[PDB]
């Protein structure tokens with residue numbers, strides 16, 4: 001059989017949400033993708049031997065209220081919290097995005113994975129250890145990625161699927 005998963009990618013403008021999504025959907029690095037386009041994308045993959053259909057909302061547009069975004073967030077099963085390892089403000093924004101998720105959710109137990117993207121860049125400003133502290137404080141996994149080299153991309157999405165499976169077993 002197959003399982004479907006409704007996933008959401010959140011984070012500050014410019015962290016690589018679209019690049020990560022496109023690495024998962026199309027298996028290469030798209031370095032110019034309209035920063036304003038918010039859409040959902042479907043890809044069938046195989047995770048731990050089970051056919052898995054991932055529907056992924058790549059958040060974008062503006063900070064102003066979008067009902068369609070809200071309705072997708074309210075029903076999302078798992079969230080990638082993406083920052084860029086060369087952008088301290090994007091890391092400090094993670095708290096805000098997690099609070100926003102918890103607010104549109106009734107459950108206190110929402111599957112999430114913290115994702116530190118752009119791991120290929122030498123100009124690092126956020127230490128892996130600072131991100132591990134924050135993920136531990138939330139009780140979620142931390143995954144390092146590069147949408148440029150594809151390092152960690154399957155790890156981020158498939159770890160979120162494994163967290164959703166654990167949630168569904170409760």
Ligand SMILES: *CCC(=O)N1CC[C@@H](C2=NC(=O)c3cc(-c4c(O)cccc4F)ncc3C2)C1
Pocket residue numbers: 009010011012013014017035036059060061062063069070073097098100101104
């Ligand atoms: C380059 C432009 C870009 O990528 N953005 C501009 C707006 C930014 C944005 N990121 C989010 O992650 C986000 C999340 C949420 C949200 C809402 O509305 C409800 C529950 C949980 C949430 F995370 N709202 C807005 C935004 C905006 C991305």
Ligand SMILES: Nc1nc2c(ncn2[C@@H]2O[C@H](COP(=O)(O)OP(=O)(O)O)[C@@H](O)[C@H]2O)c(=O)[nH]1
Pocket residue numbers: 011012013014015016017018019020030031032033034035060117118119120121145146147148149
């Ligand atoms: N070096 C590097 N650049 C990246 C990576 N991910 C995204 N980018 C670049 O970062 C910028 C923002 O990426 P984008 O996918 O538009 O971010 P979004 O606003 O979160 O959708 C673009 O110039 C991308 O080419 C990455 O892992 N490494």
Ligand SMILES: [Mg+2]
Pocket residue numbers: 017018019033034035036037058059060
């Ligand atoms: Mg984008």
